């Protein structure tokens, strides 16, 4: 294979449009033709009408903030036992983060749909319904404590 | 500095153009313009003279300078490049495969 004919396979096409020409996009810009098309219109996405923005809706969100900021609290990662049943051996937070769906998330909590393979599953929390599937063919190793 | 180059005042061959092949002693070497005076390129100046003193100056076809690249030094064997060998003390220049 030589340097000729590796070119983009018929769809890269850096065909950017040129607005000053005389045919296509002409006198005025691509689109324009009027006024307040010249340097920049307000936002306008979230913003402009000139009237009360749609900001008429209201902040229910409580706890929306506080001076010192956020409170350090344990974060539980929902991990379904359907993907858990995928591999087999002895599932612990170590494994699920080493490769899977933990991502250093503070805590592990298996739960939900899927069918439970037989094995010890060490987690920090179990859904009531999740405890059933694994109980019906496995061990329920709860979290730490100290 | 570094202005130095090929040969000096001695015997040399001319591999130029209008005077290709010719051979002769280089009577002058001006390093500034990187040209040397041999006996080849000699053109006829019509001028009486630039300075009024001495009425008759010469329609002389005197020697015209020549780019120091078209001329090559020479020895027993005709036309040779220039190697250099440090003597038992000084610094002499041997030719392609001989001495001086």
């Amino acid at each position: 294979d030589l340097r000729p004919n590796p070119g983009a396979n018929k769809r890269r096409k850096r065909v950017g449009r040129g607005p000053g020409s005389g045919h296509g996009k002409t006198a005025t810009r691509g689109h324009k033709g009027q006024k307040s098309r010249s340097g920049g219109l307000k936002d306008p996405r979230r913003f402009e009408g000139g009237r009360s923005t749609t900001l008429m809706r209201l902040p229910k969100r409580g706890m929306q903030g506080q001076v010192p900021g956020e409170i350090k609290r344990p974060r539980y990662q929902g991990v379904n036992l359907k993907d858990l049943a995928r591999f087999e051996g002895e599932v612990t937070p170590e494994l699920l983060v080493r490769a899977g769906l933990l991502k250093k998330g503070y805590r592990l909590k298996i739960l939900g749909e899927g069918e439970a393979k037989p094995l010890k599953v060490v987690a920090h929390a179990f859904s009531k319904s999740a405890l059933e599937k694994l109980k019906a063919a496995g061990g329920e190793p709860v979290l730490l404590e100290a | 500095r570094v202005k130095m180059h090929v040969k000096k005042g001695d015997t040399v061959l001319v591999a130029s153009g209008k005077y290709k092949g010719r051979v002769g002693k280089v009577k002058e070497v001006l390093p500034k313009k990187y040209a040397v005076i041999v006996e080849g390129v000699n053109i006829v100046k019509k001028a009486v003279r630039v300075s009024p003193k001495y009425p008759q100056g010469g329609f002389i076809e005197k020697e015209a300078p020549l780019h120091a690249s078209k001329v090559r030094p020479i020895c027993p064997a005709c036309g040779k490049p220039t190697r250099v060998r440090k003597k038992f003390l000084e610094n002499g220049k041997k030719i392609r495969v001989c001495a001086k």
Binding site: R45, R46, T54, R57, L58, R61, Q64 | -
Partner: protein
């Protein structure tokens, strides 16, 4: 560089898991005085928007 999330709109609008935008019913805090029990109840729940829904999406983008 790096669009900033519009805090004012995050503080009052949650985007659904699909792509819809929800918020609380307007006019339930002040005008109140004595409105049909229907009203104050109808005003408790949240709703979906329409076109500007897409407008507000374009703010909480990193969010």
């Amino acid at each position: 560089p790096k669009m900033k999330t519009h805090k004012g709109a995050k503080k009052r609008v949650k985007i659904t898991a699909s792509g819809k935008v929800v918020a609380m019913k307007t006019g339930k805090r002040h005008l109140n005085w004595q409105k049909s029990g229907k009203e104050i109840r109808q005003k408790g729940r949240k709703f979906v928007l329409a076109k500007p829904e897409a407008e507000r999406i374009k703010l909480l983008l990193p969010y």
